[PDB]
Design a protein around this ligand. Structure first.
Ligand code: OZ9
Length: 244
């Protein structure tokens, strides 16, 4: 019996109190709902940042450029983050957002095939440019929050144009939280190489009864913010709406 005005005010306040500007899009069946404190972001284009790892993984697995148990060895060079200085499967690299592993996968796929596959899936503006190893971080590839929640909807329902097994393999890599009987599958993104910086958390809730509710959070990341604010705003929003 909570009013829509109250849900909208509560979710807006989560973004306001984080001192940022953002939106979260929820999809139930075919119907989109937009909440947050900067609703016009819903149809604006931003780099996908590490949310692209979901599609990179699907492309690399479908095209036999990796397997799910393959261990990508750390080459022993210093990484931006100490946690990336280790050997990882694609799933472990998904959880750590380990850019170097997914850059290796993108190089295995190669520019020609990557561009064909990104165009085949019709992801965002579909443009990868000439640099196979950073096009999701600094452009030219861009996508809107509406497009990201629709991509999440497709993956959650096995509707992307990849084998069912490929989609199930990647979905297994995305489980980030279990709340009561709900499961949250999602991938974060933080585009630190663009100005202003973009933050994402895109995925879906699988409820105990089997319904899947996709979402995409998009906000501006600011100096000194914690990445966990993306998760915190998302979970508070999903809980306020009774989705978890
Ligand atoms: B993603 O989560 O959006 C990815 C990993 C956090 N984001 S990022 O590429 O912008 C983080 C980063 C910043 C500077 C340099 C590197 C690197 O060494 O690849 C990564």
């Amino acid at each position: 019996h909570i009013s829509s005005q109250q849900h909208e005010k509560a979710i807006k306040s989560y973004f306001d109190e984080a001192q940022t500007q953002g939106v979260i899009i929820i999809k139930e069946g075919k119907n989109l709902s937009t909440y947050g404190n900067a609703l016009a972001r819903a149809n604006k284009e931003y780099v996908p940042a590490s949310t692209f790892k979901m599609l990179n993984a699907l492309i690399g697995l479908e095209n036999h450029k990796a397997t799910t148990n393959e261990i990508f060895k750390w080459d022993g060079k210093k990484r931006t983050y100490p946690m990336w200085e280790k050997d990882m499967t694609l799933g472990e690299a998904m959880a750590l957002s380990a850019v170097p592993v997914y850059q290796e996968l993108a190089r295995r796929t190669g520019l020609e095939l990557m561009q064909k596959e990104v165009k085949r899936v019709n992801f965002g503006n579909t443009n990868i440019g000439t640099q196979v190893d950073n096009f999701w971080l600094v452009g030219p590839l861009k996508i809107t929050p509406v497009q990201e929640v629709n991509f999440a909807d497709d993956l959650a329902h096995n509707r992307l144009p990849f084998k069912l097994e490929t989609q199930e393999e990647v979905k297994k890599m995305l489980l980030i939280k279990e709340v009561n009987g709900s499961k949250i599958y999602a991938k974060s993104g933080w585009g630190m190489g663009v100005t202003p910086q973009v933050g994402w958390l895109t995925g879906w809730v699988e409820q105990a009864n089997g319904k899947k509710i996709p979402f995409s959070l998009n906000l501006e990341m600011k100096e000194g913010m914690s990445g966990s604010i993306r998760n915190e705003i998302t979970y508070k929003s999903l809980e306020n709406l009774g989705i978890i």
